[PDB]
Amino acid sequence: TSKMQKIVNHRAFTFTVIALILFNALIVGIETYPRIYADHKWLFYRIDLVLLWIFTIEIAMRFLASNPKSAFFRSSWNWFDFLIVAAGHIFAGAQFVTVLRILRVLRVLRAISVVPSLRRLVDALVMTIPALGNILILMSIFFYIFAVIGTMLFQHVSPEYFGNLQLSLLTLFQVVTLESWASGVMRPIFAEVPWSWLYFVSFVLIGTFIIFNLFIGVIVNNVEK
Amino acid sequence: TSKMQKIVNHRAFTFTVIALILFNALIVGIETYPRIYADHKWLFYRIDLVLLWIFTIEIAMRFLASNPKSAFFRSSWNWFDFLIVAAGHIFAGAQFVTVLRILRVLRVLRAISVVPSLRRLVDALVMTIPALGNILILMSIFFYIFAVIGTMLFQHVSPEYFGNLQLSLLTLFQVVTLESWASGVMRPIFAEVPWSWLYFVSFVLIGTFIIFNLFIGVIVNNVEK
Amino acid sequence: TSKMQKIVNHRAFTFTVIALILFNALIVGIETYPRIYADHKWLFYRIDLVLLWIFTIEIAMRFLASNPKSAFFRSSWNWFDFLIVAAGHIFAGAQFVTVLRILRVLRVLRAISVVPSLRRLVDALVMTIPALGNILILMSIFFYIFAVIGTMLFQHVSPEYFGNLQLSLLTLFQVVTLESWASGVMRPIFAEVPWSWLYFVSFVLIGTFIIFNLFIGVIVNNVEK
Amino acid sequence: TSKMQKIVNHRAFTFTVIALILFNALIVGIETYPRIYADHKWLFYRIDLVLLWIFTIEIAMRFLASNPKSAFFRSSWNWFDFLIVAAGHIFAGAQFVTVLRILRVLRVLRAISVVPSLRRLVDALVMTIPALGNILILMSIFFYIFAVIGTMLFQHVSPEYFGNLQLSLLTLFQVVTLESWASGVMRPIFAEVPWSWLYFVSFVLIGTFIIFNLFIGVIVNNVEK
Ligand SMILES: CCCCCCCC/C=C/CCCCCCCC(=O)O[C@@H](COC(=O)CCCCCCCCCCCCCCC)COP(=O)([O-])OCC[N+](C)(C)C
Ligand SMILES: CCCCCCCC/C=C/CCCCCCCC(=O)O[C@@H](COC(=O)CCCCCCCCCCCCCCC)COP(=O)([O-])OCC[N+](C)(C)C
Ligand SMILES: CCCCCCCC/C=C/CCCCCCCC(=O)O[C@@H](COC(=O)CCCCCCCCCCCCCCC)COP(=O)([O-])OCC[N+](C)(C)C
Ligand SMILES: CCCCCCCC/C=C/CCCCCCCC(=O)O[C@@H](COC(=O)CCCCCCCCCCCCCCC)COP(=O)([O-])OCC[N+](C)(C)C
Ligand SMILES: CCCCCCCC/C=C\CCCCCCCC(=O)O[C@@H](COC(=O)CCCCCCCCCCCCCCC)COP(=O)([O-])OCC[N+](C)(C)C
Ligand SMILES: CCCCCCCC/C=C\CCCCCCCC(=O)O[C@@H](COC(=O)CCCCCCCCCCCCCCC)COP(=O)([O-])OCC[N+](C)(C)C
Ligand SMILES: CCCCCCCC/C=C\CCCCCCCC(=O)O[C@@H](COC(=O)CCCCCCCCCCCCCCC)COP(=O)([O-])OCC[N+](C)(C)C
Ligand SMILES: CCCCCCCC/C=C\CCCCCCCC(=O)O[C@@H](COC(=O)CCCCCCCCCCCCCCC)COP(=O)([O-])OCC[N+](C)(C)C
Ligand code: NA
Ligand code: NA
């Protein structure tokens, strides 16, 4: 025999939850001001516990009235909600307290799934990645090749930018965004090894011919259907 | 009984007004040269008063011959004109005189509405925002989440960029435009907290995957109809 | 009675001219090396005179066999060629010799019109400006408004960037390209007048919402037909 | 009489080769850590020789069972593979050893052709260049003209940026990407020769009106068919 499955889908419930979130998006933006932080310390503690408990019972009521161990877990969205709330209860203890606050901010991130207009949008934004699934592998192979070539070439001439396979993977990401790729990344080096203009000029051409052909691929694909 | 509603829509009136504006766009660009400013001081005063009065009577003649208290106020454009001119008469006094000059420059902005070719264009440019009304909320939620996370993480390590919820909202806007996001914003910080490359690299990827999907959304939408 | 109009349109003539240009594109790129410049001085003088004369007779033969004072001047392209060559003969004298060399380089620019594949392309690229003829006026009005507002606001706080109506028109062009608009242009100023983040943030949003709507306008228009 | 042409196209062969490559993409990324490099020196030597030999016999088996001296060489892809492997055997000697390592990294680049999903993609990405074959010539002519004009104009005022026809060809490439084109490239110069704002402002407008019309050309072309 069923039960109160007719109120969790009521319109006087979504608005309650969004009001709660928006209040939590404010109580967590406010507590970044040390002045008002210490002045109302041990109040944020309580109100955080309250909001956490309300959210916990909230997902609970959204679980019982949704085909128990059947469909509630068949969706990714429900898993996202339950994951955050459970993560709230998990880390609550004498630990690296800082990782507890980021979870509160992510609670405000949950406002994406309780606004049916946004949930559908982010679904559309996520189900376009499988389309550009090959260009991304081709972009990763070239990122890797250049990250190895740059490391074994500019290791003892600029250890800040090309020091290891990771620092030189970061330098290669600053350059695809064309951020100081020449004034800072490539001018000092091109003074030591003069044939190095070939590395950066060939990378900026290839790495930008692939990016613009990913962008065009999405334009064509989305317009197609 | 009607009156001279047949001259405000005459073509020998729009050209008069545009001539007046273009003259005011010149008399206000010229007065930014202190040399010629002081040398012809107390002349700009008079000519400003003249232009203001002509503009005032101008909107008046555009009001009486346009269904009195009926349609003249039903449009946004007419409200824009009347608002500027009234703002001219409002602030004229012994006050922060500098806020009076900006109103003159905005008088030249009014040239958008008296050129029927431009008015229609800006109407089309404004009535495309409701289309991208969801992507903007999704972009604002992520701006806010990252502005709070960055503030409560990089507060005592770079107070210039992430000092409060607002300074760190400005830093996060410089980074979406990819302006010195790594050379200046993220290199000094990544030296203090080494795991911070995750903050900026994840933000530049997410915040740019949303922007390019807003741009594509507009391309698809406008091409659609 | 007609004459040799059947050789200027011969295919053994375009190739001669392109060979000449490509040789002039080399003789003018080579003379920028002072070493080989002085070492073969007074040779470049002669060969320049030769090439100039050949080009002059070349347009002459392209003039006589093309409906004398009828259609030869009805086209813009022919005017472009004749203008450059005449400009070559005009400035040749005891003058600011430097303005003579730029004319040689522009002779190599003439290679656009003698390659029928390029001439058609640049025609298509030029006859799309009348399409975006309104967005450009709307972009110019906003450039001007902000150039005046910035000048009468940031004149005595950063005379390098906003000194007059022109220096502040240049600063406003560096910012639409998002080049150091915050690290260099807006950070020093935002320290003097704190409410100035409104100027640059509002300009970067408006000036980029118009540019992307010009780009989209061209995409839609060109795809349309 | 034919032979074992039925195993090189077996699906238990492509996976073997990709496993080998992915292992070589790891053995070459790992050897950029000097710590683990010297500690396991003279082991990388052996394993490199092994992988090289396996790859050599691998292309050999892909050659014999593919119409001997007929079609194996009619394709560009097969030439690419054989070229890399032969280049591996070629340079192996008492020479500039550094050019030997880059060949290993390029062996991992070969993973593009043995993944039928990628090979087709890169074919599509390469057969779109003939489409934009005219815009590229028009872009090269303007790059060259400006590279000569800038060199013969800003030679003795900024020898770092415009020193010769090549250094000024590099400066002109940093500017089309809008990287520090004003803060670094054009501000110091505009202080010496004041009319030089014309060079950079006219170049950034022309060189960006051509790039955006190349991008649009590809959008239109790819959407067309
Ligand atoms: C279908 C084809 C797919 C093509 C993809 C190719 C993928 C091929 C994958 C290749 C794998 C790369 C080789 C891994 C080498 C790590 C081993 C190592 O040396 O660790 C070092 C530590 O240093 C570290 O801290 C580890 C850092 C991890 C490197 C991350 C690079 C991942 C590249 C991903 C590229 C993705 C693309 C990038 C853009 C997204 C240890 O050495 P040590 O410093 O001397 O310290 C002493 C040892 N100790 C620590 C035990 C005491
Ligand atoms: C559908 C879901 C929507 C999601 C949207 C989520 C929106 C949720 C909204 C969240 C609201 C954010 C919390 C506001 C906290 C202000 C209170 C405060 O502490 O003031 C401080 C002053 O400091 C100031 O000067 C006030 C500055 C206003 C902050 C502007 C951030 C707005 C974020 C908008 C984000 C938009 C996105 C950004 C990109 C566009 C006072 O503290 P004090 O300094 O110690 O001074 C002593 C007090 N005294 C001054 C009285 C003497
Ligand atoms: C349909 C609606 C259209 C809307 C468009 C609005 C256009 C409205 C047009 C407005 C015109 C702007 C006012 C001109 C003022 C110049 C007078 C002056 O003071 O000269 C000064 C010299 O300084 C100079 O060297 C002159 C520099 C010319 C300014 C170029 C700005 C053009 C703006 C174009 C904007 C285009 C957009 C920008 C983006 C493309 C003289 O003063 P002085 O220094 O003290 O020297 C002593 C005098 N002496 C030199 C004689 C001895
Ligand atoms: C259809 C129409 C097509 C239009 C295209 C137009 C193409 C027209 C082509 C024009 C060719 C350009 C002229 C070449 C001049 C080199 C001669 C020289 O002086 O060498 C100097 C060395 O300096 C060097 O090291 C050589 C560097 C090569 C210059 C590369 C520019 C290529 C431009 C490509 C532009 C492509 C576009 C750019 C963007 C991709 C020698 O002089 P020196 O220093 O005093 O040393 C003493 C001599 N010594 C060394 C023997 C001892
Ligand atoms: C990868 C693509 C290449 C393109 C080829 C183009 C032509 C190839 C041009 C030149 C090739 C040969 C150069 C001769 C000298 C080489 C060695 C050298 O010494 O370097 C010298 C110059 O070298 C440069 O500065 C490179 C010039 C930049 C070319 C950028 C082209 C942008 C393409 C635009 C794309 C748009 C169009 C799209 C069309 C694709 C510098 O060293 P140095 O002078 O000896 O000084 C001493 C060392 N010191 C610095 C420490 C003091
Ligand atoms: C968010 C997405 C991640 C992507 C994962 C990719 C693989 C993940 C790779 C590495 C992951 C693990 C790194 C091992 C070390 C971590 C901790 C650390 O010490 O940092 C170290 C290095 O760390 C880096 O520099 C990060 C490398 C930049 C990766 C950028 C990938 C760009 C994606 C391209 C997108 C295009 C393709 C699109 C495909 C999506 C730095 O610290 P340190 O060495 O100890 O030095 C001491 C501290 N000190 C600096 C103060 C002196
Ligand atoms: C134009 C659009 C506005 C947007 C409104 C957004 C919310 C409005 C937020 C705040 C509004 C009110 C701010 C309170 C303080 C104002 C006065 C002040 O003192 O400034 C202070 C902070 O001020 C800032 O730093 C501005 C924050 C940048 C907002 C950028 C939003 C990016 C939009 C993203 C677009 C993507 C989404 C698209 C959606 C459109 C700085 O001064 P101070 O702290 O007193 O320090 C002393 C002075 N000193 C610096 C010299 C030492
Ligand atoms: C190529 C296109 C041009 C556009 C024309 C626009 C109007 C033309 C405007 C002015 C033209 C005439 C200027 C008068 C002075 C010239 C000589 C001079 O002295 O320079 C002076 C100022 O000069 C500038 O700063 C130039 C202003 C930048 C205009 C950028 C327009 C951006 C177009 C936006 C595109 C978007 C819209 C698209 C529409 C296309 C500087 O020298 P000085 O003051 O004597 O100082 C002493 C020297 N010192 C510096 C070493 C100390
Ligand atoms: Na940029
Ligand atoms: Na930059």
PDB file of C-alpha atoms in Angstrom, chain C residues 109-213:
ATOM      1  CA  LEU C 109      50.252  44.218 -52.293  1.00  0.00           C
ATOM      2  CA  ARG C 110      49.038  44.670 -55.861  1.00  0.00           C
ATOM      3  CA  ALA C 111      49.459  40.898 -56.324  1.00  0.00           C
ATOM      4  CA  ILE C 112      45.913  40.594 -54.966  1.00  0.00           C
ATOM      5  CA  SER C 113      44.283  41.961 -58.124  1.00  0.00           C
ATOM      6  CA  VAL C 114      46.269  40.073 -60.778  1.00  0.00           C
ATOM      7  CA  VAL C 115      45.361  36.670 -59.337  1.00  0.00           C
ATOM      8  CA  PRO C 116      41.717  36.197 -60.406  1.00  0.00           C
ATOM      9  CA  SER C 117      41.212  33.740 -57.553  1.00  0.00           C
ATOM     10  CA  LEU C 118      42.194  36.331 -54.949  1.00  0.00           C
ATOM     11  CA  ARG C 119      40.468  39.322 -56.546  1.00  0.00           C
ATOM     12  CA  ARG C 120      37.111  37.567 -56.297  1.00  0.00           C
ATOM     13  CA  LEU C 121      37.769  36.589 -52.688  1.00  0.00           C
ATOM     14  CA  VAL C 122      38.599  40.117 -51.540  1.00  0.00           C
ATOM     15  CA  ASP C 123      35.525  41.354 -53.383  1.00  0.00           C
ATOM     16  CA  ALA C 124      33.417  38.965 -51.309  1.00  0.00           C
ATOM     17  CA  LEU C 125      35.202  40.048 -48.130  1.00  0.00           C
ATOM     18  CA  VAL C 126      34.558  43.731 -48.851  1.00  0.00           C
ATOM     19  CA  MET C 127      30.903  43.422 -49.885  1.00  0.00           C
ATOM     20  CA  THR C 128      29.928  42.051 -46.468  1.00  0.00           C
ATOM     21  CA  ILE C 129      30.637  45.314 -44.622  1.00  0.00           C
ATOM     22  CA  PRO C 130      27.369  46.935 -45.817  1.00  0.00           C
ATOM     23  CA  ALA C 131      25.616  44.056 -44.066  1.00  0.00           C
ATOM     24  CA  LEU C 132      27.092  44.890 -40.648  1.00  0.00           C
ATOM     25  CA  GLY C 133      26.632  48.601 -41.203  1.00  0.00           C
ATOM     26  CA  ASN C 134      24.339  49.241 -38.253  1.00  0.00           C
ATOM     27  CA  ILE C 135      26.169  47.236 -35.593  1.00  0.00           C
ATOM     28  CA  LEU C 136      29.265  49.265 -36.440  1.00  0.00           C
ATOM     29  CA  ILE C 137      27.457  52.539 -35.782  1.00  0.00           C
ATOM     30  CA  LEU C 138      26.101  51.171 -32.509  1.00  0.00           C
ATOM     31  CA  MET C 139      29.616  50.056 -31.585  1.00  0.00           C
ATOM     32  CA  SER C 140      31.038  53.478 -32.450  1.00  0.00           C
ATOM     33  CA  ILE C 141      28.474  55.328 -30.330  1.00  0.00           C
ATOM     34  CA  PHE C 142      29.368  53.221 -27.305  1.00  0.00           C
ATOM     35  CA  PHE C 143      33.095  53.572 -27.960  1.00  0.00           C
ATOM     36  CA  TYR C 144      32.636  57.334 -28.062  1.00  0.00           C
ATOM     37  CA  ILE C 145      30.425  57.574 -24.974  1.00  0.00           C
ATOM     38  CA  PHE C 146      32.853  55.525 -22.926  1.00  0.00           C
ATOM     39  CA  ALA C 147      35.833  57.425 -24.333  1.00  0.00           C
ATOM     40  CA  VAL C 148      34.361  60.711 -23.118  1.00  0.00           C
ATOM     41  CA  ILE C 149      33.173  59.373 -19.769  1.00  0.00           C
ATOM     42  CA  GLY C 150      36.535  57.769 -19.088  1.00  0.00           C
ATOM     43  CA  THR C 151      38.427  60.913 -20.027  1.00  0.00           C
ATOM     44  CA  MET C 152      36.436  63.246 -17.796  1.00  0.00           C
ATOM     45  CA  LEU C 153      36.734  60.742 -14.949  1.00  0.00           C
ATOM     46  CA  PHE C 154      40.248  59.303 -15.039  1.00  0.00           C
ATOM     47  CA  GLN C 155      42.154  62.293 -16.380  1.00  0.00           C
ATOM     48  CA  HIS C 156      44.250  63.300 -13.358  1.00  0.00           C
ATOM     49  CA  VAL C 157      44.583  59.749 -12.014  1.00  0.00           C
ATOM     50  CA  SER C 158      46.160  57.975 -15.014  1.00  0.00           C
ATOM     51  CA  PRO C 159      47.224  60.406 -17.753  1.00  0.00           C
ATOM     52  CA  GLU C 160      48.943  57.638 -19.710  1.00  0.00           C
ATOM     53  CA  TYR C 161      45.751  55.713 -20.408  1.00  0.00           C
ATOM     54  CA  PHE C 162      43.014  58.352 -20.105  1.00  0.00           C
ATOM     55  CA  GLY C 163      44.736  61.616 -20.903  1.00  0.00           C
ATOM     56  CA  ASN C 164      42.651  63.022 -23.724  1.00  0.00           C
ATOM     57  CA  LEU C 165      39.827  61.912 -25.981  1.00  0.00           C
ATOM     58  CA  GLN C 166      42.355  60.066 -28.159  1.00  0.00           C
ATOM     59  CA  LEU C 167      44.622  58.338 -25.648  1.00  0.00           C
ATOM     60  CA  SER C 168      41.448  57.160 -23.938  1.00  0.00           C
ATOM     61  CA  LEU C 169      40.134  55.999 -27.299  1.00  0.00           C
ATOM     62  CA  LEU C 170      43.229  53.822 -27.586  1.00  0.00           C
ATOM     63  CA  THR C 171      42.923  52.463 -24.048  1.00  0.00           C
ATOM     64  CA  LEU C 172      39.337  51.551 -24.877  1.00  0.00           C
ATOM     65  CA  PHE C 173      40.533  49.595 -27.909  1.00  0.00           C
ATOM     66  CA  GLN C 174      43.106  47.627 -25.947  1.00  0.00           C
ATOM     67  CA  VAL C 175      40.313  46.628 -23.562  1.00  0.00           C
ATOM     68  CA  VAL C 176      37.840  45.298 -26.136  1.00  0.00           C
ATOM     69  CA  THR C 177      40.555  42.881 -27.249  1.00  0.00           C
ATOM     70  CA  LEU C 178      40.783  41.888 -23.568  1.00  0.00           C
ATOM     71  CA  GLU C 179      44.508  42.605 -23.607  1.00  0.00           C
ATOM     72  CA  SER C 180      45.707  43.374 -20.075  1.00  0.00           C
ATOM     73  CA  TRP C 181      42.407  45.106 -19.458  1.00  0.00           C
ATOM     74  CA  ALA C 182      42.556  44.268 -15.766  1.00  0.00           C
ATOM     75  CA  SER C 183      46.148  43.553 -14.864  1.00  0.00           C
ATOM     76  CA  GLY C 184      47.373  46.775 -16.429  1.00  0.00           C
ATOM     77  CA  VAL C 185      44.516  49.064 -17.432  1.00  0.00           C
ATOM     78  CA  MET C 186      42.051  48.605 -14.546  1.00  0.00           C
ATOM     79  CA  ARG C 187      44.007  47.559 -11.462  1.00  0.00           C
ATOM     80  CA  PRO C 188      45.997  50.700 -10.897  1.00  0.00           C
ATOM     81  CA  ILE C 189      42.943  52.926 -11.392  1.00  0.00           C
ATOM     82  CA  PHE C 190      40.639  50.807  -9.238  1.00  0.00           C
ATOM     83  CA  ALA C 191      43.051  51.570  -6.391  1.00  0.00           C
ATOM     84  CA  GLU C 192      42.504  55.339  -6.661  1.00  0.00           C
ATOM     85  CA  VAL C 193      38.763  55.572  -7.396  1.00  0.00           C
ATOM     86  CA  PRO C 194      37.194  52.418  -5.917  1.00  0.00           C
ATOM     87  CA  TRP C 195      33.881  52.676  -7.774  1.00  0.00           C
ATOM     88  CA  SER C 196      35.730  52.397 -11.088  1.00  0.00           C
ATOM     89  CA  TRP C 197      35.307  48.640 -11.338  1.00  0.00           C
ATOM     90  CA  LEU C 198      31.882  49.633 -12.646  1.00  0.00           C
ATOM     91  CA  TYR C 199      33.345  51.423 -15.651  1.00  0.00           C
ATOM     92  CA  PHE C 200      35.495  48.540 -16.863  1.00  0.00           C
ATOM     93  CA  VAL C 201      33.208  45.670 -15.887  1.00  0.00           C
ATOM     94  CA  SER C 202      30.223  47.322 -17.560  1.00  0.00           C
ATOM     95  CA  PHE C 203      32.300  48.153 -20.619  1.00  0.00           C
ATOM     96  CA  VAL C 204      33.726  44.645 -21.025  1.00  0.00           C
ATOM     97  CA  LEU C 205      30.218  43.180 -20.782  1.00  0.00           C
ATOM     98  CA  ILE C 206      28.547  45.629 -23.158  1.00  0.00           C
ATOM     99  CA  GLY C 207      31.431  45.857 -25.612  1.00  0.00           C
ATOM    100  CA  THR C 208      31.640  42.078 -25.813  1.00  0.00           C
ATOM    101  CA  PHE C 209      27.893  41.468 -26.048  1.00  0.00           C
ATOM    102  CA  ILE C 210      27.936  43.705 -29.109  1.00  0.00           C
ATOM    103  CA  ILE C 211      30.979  42.096 -30.699  1.00  0.00           C
ATOM    104  CA  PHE C 212      29.630  38.564 -30.314  1.00  0.00           C
ATOM    105  CA  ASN C 213      26.326  39.766 -31.769  1.00  0.00           C
TER     106      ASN C 213
END
